[PDB]
Amino acid sequence: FGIDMNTDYTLEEVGKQFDVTRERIRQIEAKALRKLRHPSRSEVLRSFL
Amino acid sequence: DPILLRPVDDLELTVRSANCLKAEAIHYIGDLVQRTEVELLKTPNLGKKSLTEIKDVLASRGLSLGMRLENWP
Incomplete structure (x- = not known):
């Protein structure tokens, strides 16, 4: 997601950035998404919906 | 204590x-x-290590282990 920068990238376009394969980054991002759904890190975020 | 439930x-x-x-x-x-x-x-x-982590996080959250609880549920 293009946070505090220019154009966002896809899974493959960030694969070259870290040398990781496309699929693992989809899982690396998936676990990062998984952490933020947990409480004590999502209370204030739910007030924006 | 609302944090217990x-x-x-x-x-x-x-x-x-x-x-x-959960198991x-x-x-x-x-x-x-x-x-x-x-x-x-x-069990x-x-x-x-897992029990040590549990004890540390409970102590950091103000709780502990082996506390006597009444009227449960």
């Missing part, structure tokens, strides 16, 4: 500890602090 997910446990806790039929943090240390030690796949 909250689900055990609010403790931010790891996959191993949370899966073992040991505990769903309340008050139940988890109600049980004694030896009772959790005897399979609960070793020293």
